[PDB]
Design an enzyme around this catalytic site. Structure first.
Site, PDB file in Angstrom:
ATOM      1  N   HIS A  64       0.802  -1.190   0.000  1.00 34.90           N
ATOM      2  CA  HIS A  64       0.000   0.000   0.000  1.00 34.90           C
ATOM      3  C   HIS A  64       0.854   1.268   0.000  1.00 34.90           C
ATOM      4  O   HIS A  64       0.391   2.319  -0.422  1.00 34.90           O
ATOM      5  CB  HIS A  64      -1.050  -0.045   1.132  1.00 34.90           C
ATOM      6  CG  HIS A  64      -0.510   0.238   2.487  1.00 34.90           C
ATOM      7  ND1 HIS A  64      -0.298  -0.753   3.423  1.00 34.90           N
ATOM      8  CD2 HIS A  64      -0.163   1.402   3.081  1.00 34.90           C
ATOM      9  CE1 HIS A  64       0.166  -0.208   4.536  1.00 34.90           C
ATOM     10  NE2 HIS A  64       0.256   1.098   4.353  1.00 34.90           N
ATOM     11  N   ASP A 206       1.652  -7.849   2.485  1.00 34.90           N
ATOM     12  CA  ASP A 206       1.684  -6.410   2.226  1.00 34.90           C
ATOM     13  C   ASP A 206       3.122  -5.908   2.018  1.00 34.90           C
ATOM     14  O   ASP A 206       3.705  -5.268   2.890  1.00 34.90           O
ATOM     15  CB  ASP A 206       0.989  -5.684   3.369  1.00 34.90           C
ATOM     16  CG  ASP A 206       0.527  -4.267   2.994  1.00 34.90           C
ATOM     17  OD1 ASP A 206       0.987  -3.708   1.964  1.00 34.90           O
ATOM     18  OD2 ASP A 206      -0.314  -3.705   3.743  1.00 34.90           O
ATOM     19  N   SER A 634       3.959   2.340   8.649  1.00 33.41           N
ATOM     20  CA  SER A 634       3.641   1.468   7.537  1.00 33.41           C
ATOM     21  C   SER A 634       4.986   1.144   6.838  1.00 33.41           C
ATOM     22  O   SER A 634       5.762   2.052   6.547  1.00 33.41           O
ATOM     23  CB  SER A 634       2.635   2.123   6.567  1.00 33.41           C
ATOM     24  OG  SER A 634       1.457   2.680   7.177  1.00 33.41           O
TER      25      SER A 634
END
Length: 699
Positions: A64, A206, A634
């Site tokens: 992402h 991810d 992240s």
């Protein structure tokens, strides 16, 4: 364990880290005067974190994180977002338009320097001690005008910490030619993305892979066909040893913000106003949009992204209030301040009790304006799409007056482009009218006549309290209610039509009050900030920074803890590790969210896991840890006890969302993609052997 620690607190935290199982030597992960594992961490593209995992500058971060740029290189023939992307050689690596990575080259404490400077400001109430302009000016005469020409691709930044009680200078090193190396297909990168957002257990692969390119001498250089792969100062070794329950983990990266030093009253305000209004308003909005999405498959396609984006902060607010209601956040902050009050009495300095009282009284004085501000932002500015419809700019107004028909057409043609962007392929007036009617009804029930943005007064004064009619009338008479109505206007444009256009009037009136409230409210931040400085000063004097971390501020931090599952509610236990089984168990081929890549299905049916499976032959996917994480983390590398990479962080569980106010040892977990799953996907899904050979993989 609690805290987002400054690199200069590594010293003070090292015993508590060794007790948790840390084996590495301190100077091996942060040295101010040498090379260290710090030098393998990057701020990826402004908000994310990334890590350098080879000598030829390969970088890992989250899917992402790398999404927009994977999307950019995606044509309808070569749909890399859907299928993935695996550059078979260094030269097939795709460059990217508006990307960066930032190494943190040096960090120095400059509190004494910065405090002395401030000491020559006559004004006691100057907010220059937190002004980024002012701090940037103090930075530029430290490193010397003219530092960045003389040191190419370096820059400097000073930032405030602990509410103005500590200042650091950061020497940054920014590379701008960062190419796409590899990405899994989105079925793996976003597996369960909407439904499993904030959820543990989690099954999402991810990751995305990039490379840093520079000049021949390894210096920052914008994209040029002559650039070559960077040789970093240091890179992370990739462990294959896996993780187990109670293993030590630590993370480094760039957390955005926390509110660890909130007063009790500030907590009450965040729950009462900020979170409750978000929750109420987004329920309403989400209801109407749910309803209209089920009735019509075409609405479902058009509204998905808007619905899920509203849903992201919604659930965050739900998590935070659950923690406020059940885990005693308010009592925790009451205790801490009472503790300082009592200690400050005994020292004979009422200063700290003064600071707390000052935050209290201010918070209570601004309650109504803040309530009003949140009602408008949540209810209308975000709630209602036609709130964000075109206002004519003063330049366009000017050209619609008087004279020049080419200038008249030019002003119109770029209002056309704004109108076109508001009423795009995903906008439905019919949905917007229904959403508006419900939101406006709740807004009118809460906000009294005398405090209403001007146009909303017409609901009482002219439509007899009928909110459906008022909204129907805005669409019926307005030049932006439909294409044909806009065209009719464009042919015979006039500023007096725009001046009296009820949508324009609504839009600009609503934004007027939004602005006016921002402005009345802004003056109340300053006393709180000033008292906050005094408050944190006392907490530090009294108890030390040993167990009192500085609020996050987009600065490089480390956090440590353990690989540990938890119990979310009576009689349910989540463990520390998910597996590829959970991917299979979750397969739904008729829902994009839970599609399973065919190559992955096949890797699972043959148990073709190789050296990446665990003892007992299960294929690991993700794990969770007691590490203390937030927006900005992240993609952060997760290290084991020897500093070797064991995974990448990519989310927090919803029970840990109040972690921004208070760490919750029994609930808060970081959710991490297992590095072994990363390598599996590269190896057996991408086929991309070269970058495995590139990484230094350790047993």
């Amino acid at each position: 364990d609690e805290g987002m620690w400054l690199m200069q607190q590594l010293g003070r935290k090292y015993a508590q880290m060794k007790e948790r199982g840390l084996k590495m030597k301190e100077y091996d992960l942060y040295n101010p005067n040498g090379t260290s594992l710090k030098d393998a961490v990057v701020l990826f593209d402004g908000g994310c974190t990334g890590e350098v995992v080879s000598d030829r500058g390969l970088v890992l971060t989250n899917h992402h994180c790398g999404y927009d740029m994977i999307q950019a290189h995606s044509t309808l023939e070569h749909n890399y977002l859907e299928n993935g992307f695996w550059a078979m050689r260094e030269a097939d690596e795709l460059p990217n338009k508006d990307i960066s990575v930032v190494f943190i080259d040096k960090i120095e404490d400059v509190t004494d320097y910065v405090k002395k400077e401030l000491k020559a400001i006559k004004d006691p109430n100057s907010m220059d001690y937190l002004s980024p302009k002012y701090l940037q000016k103090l930075a530029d005469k430290k490193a010397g005008k003219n530092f960045s020409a003389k040191n190419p691709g370096l820059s400097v930044e000073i930032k405030a910490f602990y509410g103005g009680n500590l200042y650091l200078m950061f020497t940054k090193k920014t590379y701008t030619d960062v190419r796409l190396v590899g990405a899994p297909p989105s079925s793996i990168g976003k597996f369960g993305a909407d439904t499993d957002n904030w959820i543990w257990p989690r099954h999402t692969g991810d990751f995305s892979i990039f490379r840093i390119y520079a000049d021949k001498n390894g210096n920052p250089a914008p994209y040029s066909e002559d650039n070559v792969p960077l040789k970093p100062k240091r890179f992370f070794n990739i462990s294959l040893g896996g993780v187990q329950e109670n293993d030590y983990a630590m993370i480094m990266g760039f957390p955005g913000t926390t509110h660890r030093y909130f007063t009790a009253s500030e907590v009450d305000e965040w729950k009462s106003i900020d979170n409750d209004i978000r929750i109420r308003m987004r329920d309403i909005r989400q209801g109407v949009m749910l309803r209209e999405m089920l009735a019509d498959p075409q609405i479902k396609i058009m509204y998905s992204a808007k619905y899920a984006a509203s849903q992201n902060a919604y659930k965050r607010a739900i998590g935070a209030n659950w923690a406020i209601k059940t885990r005693g956040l308010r009592q925790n902050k009451q205790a801490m301040q009472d503790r300082l009050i009592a200690w400050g009495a005994k020292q004979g300095t009422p200063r700290y009790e003064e600071a707390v009282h000052e935050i209290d009284a201010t918070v209570a004085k601004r309650a109504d304006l803040r309530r009003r501000y949140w009602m408008i932002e949540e209810g209308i500015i975000r709630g209602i799409e036609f709130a964000r419809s075109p206002i004519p700019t003063e330049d366009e107004t000017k050209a619609l007056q008087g004279n020049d028909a080419s200038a008249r057409k030019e002003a119109i043609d770029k209002i056309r482009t704004r109108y076109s962007k508001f009423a795009n392929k995903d906008y439905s007036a019919e949905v917007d009218k229904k959403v508006a009617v419900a939101m406006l009804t709740e807004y009118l029930k809460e906000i009294p006549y005398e405090n209403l943005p001007l146009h909303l007064r017409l609901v009482k004064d002219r439509f007899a309290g009928d909110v459906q009619a008022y909204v129907d009338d805005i669409f019926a008479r307005s030049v932006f209610g439909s294409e044909a109505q806009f065209d009719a206007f464009a042919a015979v444009p006039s500023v007096e039509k725009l001046a009296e256009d009820p949508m324009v009037l609504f839009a600009s009136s609503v934004f007027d009050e939004y602005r006016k409230l921002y402005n009345e409210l802004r003056p109340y931040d300053d006393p709180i900030l000033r008292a906050q400085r005094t408050y944190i000063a006392g907490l530090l004097e009294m108890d030390g920074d040993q167990d009192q971390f500085p609020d996050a501020n987009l600065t490089l931090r480390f956090t440590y803890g353990q690989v540990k599952g938890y119990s979310p509610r009576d009689n349910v236990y989540y463990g520390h590790q998910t597996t590829l089984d959970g991917v299979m168990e979750k397969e739904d081929p008729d829902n994009w969210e839970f599609v399973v890549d065919p190559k992955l299905k096949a890797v699972y049916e043959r148990k073709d896991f190789g050296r990446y499976a665990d003892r007992s032959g299960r294929m690991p996917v993700a794990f969770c840890a007691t590490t203390h994480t937030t927006g900005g983390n992240s993609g952060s590398p997760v290290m084991n006890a020897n500093g070797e990479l064991i995974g990448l962080n990519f989310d927090r569980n919803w029970e840990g969302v109040g972690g921004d106010i208070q760490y919750l040892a029994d609930y808060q977990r970081s959710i991490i993609v297992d590095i072994r799953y990363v390598l599996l996907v590269i190896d057996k899904v991408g086929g991309c052997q070269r970058l495995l050979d590139e990484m230094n993989i350790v047993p």
